[PDB]
Design a protein around this ligand. Structure first.
Ligand SMILES: CNS(=O)(=O)Cc1cc(C)on1
Length: 185
């Protein structure tokens, strides 16, 4: 792919984070804490899952960024509508305002309804995310495997401003403590 020149500098919005998340001082890394991180509750925080949004809002143009997922067992990545539900249980689907992929139990799936099996020969250490607002496209690339296509959502109905979306996943196993990191341009 030739999307690298649409690179945007993404930072994490602390106020949207689940109360157990630790966001680095530079707002470029997030990991699951082993306890509540002593922050006040607010209506923006994801209550049920270890999720957080990027600060940046997109309503036009072409945007590209990369995320490090090294040594993680579980995560969700992509983009969501600014107005997605924060409280209670929900599924990651376009109907709910999410355009995402994930790793769970040694398989990669796209967050369609129902979910779609991905075909990945080389487990990714970094994921590229491309959004074309006007075209209605969200694409995912395997940086570890020469930027090979993972998945394309086409005919997307964003229906609002988009925010980068992140889930560091739970760490019941003690093998999923590693952070998500926004990789440098
Ligand atoms: C790639 N197919 S899609 O993203 O699910 C299309 C869609 C459905 C709704 C709702 O908003 N966009």
């Amino acid at each position: 792919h030739h999307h690298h020149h649409h690179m945007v500098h993404i930072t994490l919005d602390r106020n949207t984070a689940n109360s157990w998340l630790i966001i680095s001082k530079d707002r470029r890394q997030v990991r699951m804490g082993d306890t509540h991180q002593n922050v006040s509750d607010n209506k923006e925080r994801f209550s049920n899952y270890p999720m957080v949004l990027g600060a940046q809002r997109f309503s036009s143009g072409k945007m590209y960024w990369e995320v490090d997922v090294t040594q993680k067992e579980a995560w969700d990545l992509g983009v969501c509508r600014d107005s997605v539900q924060r409280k209670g249980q929900f599924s990651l689907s376009p109907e709910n305002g999410f355009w995402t992929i994930w790793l769970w139990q040694d398989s990669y799936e796209a967050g369609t309804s129902p979910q779609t099996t991905l075909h990945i020969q080389v487990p990714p250490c970094q994921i590229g995310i491309f959004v074309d607002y006007e075209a209605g496209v969200v694409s995912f690339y395997n940086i570890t495997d020469h930027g090979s296509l993972i998945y394309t959502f086409s005919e997307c109905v964003f229906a609002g401003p988009l925010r980068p979306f992140f889930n560091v996943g739970f760490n019941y196993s003690g093998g999923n403590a590693a952070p998500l990191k926004l990789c440098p341009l």
